[PDB]
Amino acid sequence: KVFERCELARTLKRLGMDGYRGISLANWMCLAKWESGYNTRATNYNAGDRSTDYGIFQINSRYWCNDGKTPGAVNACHLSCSALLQDNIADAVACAKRVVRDPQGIRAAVAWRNRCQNRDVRQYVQGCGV
């Protein structure tokens, strides 16, 4: 499913993401947008290390979810990567919360650094009623 901007904003809010570990909703929106274009079906194969990024947040199969074909897979979220391609993002959200609980926080995601960090990201939630 490809979420509409405000629709995703409200969904993330209901799931307790606003201010999670100090990360505003606008920052989460900026991340989802640049990772997948708000597309839950997005996947990206990393030919170099044999891993794959899944879903709306492009979570990686080496550390977070298990897809059975990634070398050195950790499965920190204790989820099948399949769970991250559902139209319902509840599982993706639970795993994205586990990710930022690491010392690096949202800084871990390079996409956030390249297009969200130190930039005005309020534009992502404006008009959504959140």
From Swiss-Prot:
Q: Which reactions is this enzyme annotated as catalysing?
A: Hydrolysis of (1->4)-beta-linkages between N-acetylmuramic acid and N-acetyl-D-glucosamine residues in a peptidoglycan and between N-acetyl-D-glucosamine residues in chitodextrins
What more does the record tell us?
Lysozyme C is capable of both hydrolysis and transglycosylation; it also shows a slight esterase activity. It acts rapidly on both peptide-substituted and unsubstituted peptidoglycan, and slowly on chitin oligosaccharides.
Active site location: E35, D53
Which keywords fit this entry according to its UniProt record?
Amyloid, Amyloidosis, Antimicrobial, Bacteriolytic enzyme, Disease variant, Disulfide bond, Glycosidase, Hydrolase, Secreted, Signal
What are the annotated GO cellular component locations? azurophil granule lumen; extracellular exosome; extracellular region; extracellular space; specific granule lumen; tertiary granule lumen
Q: What job does this protein perform?
A: Lysozymes have primarily a bacteriolytic function; those in tissues and body fluids are associated with the monocyte-macrophage system and enhance the activity of immunoagents.
Indicate what this protein is called per its UniProt record: Lysozyme C
Highest taxon of the lineage: Eukaryota
| Family listed | Belongs to the glycosyl hydrolase 22 family.
The molecular function terms in GO held by this entry are: identical protein binding; lysozyme activity
Pathological condition linked to this protein in its record:
Amyloidosis, hereditary systemic 5: A form of hereditary systemic amyloidosis, a disorder characterized by amyloid deposition in multiple tissues resulting in a wide clinical spectrum. AMYLD5 primarily affects the viscera, and the predominant clinical features are renal dysfunction of varying severity, and intra-abdominal bleeding. Inheritance is autosomal dominant.
Pfam families attached to this UniProt entry: Lys
The residue ranges of the C-type lysozyme domain are 1-130
Chief location category = secreted
The listed locations are: Secreted
Query: A GO biological process this protein is involved in?
Result: defense response to bacterium
Under which EC number(s) is this enzyme classified?
A: 3.2.1.17
InterPro entries found in the cross-reference section: Glyco_hydro_22 (IPR001916), Glyco_hydro_22_CS (IPR019799), Glyco_hydro_22_lys (IPR000974), Lysozyme-like_dom_sf (IPR023346)
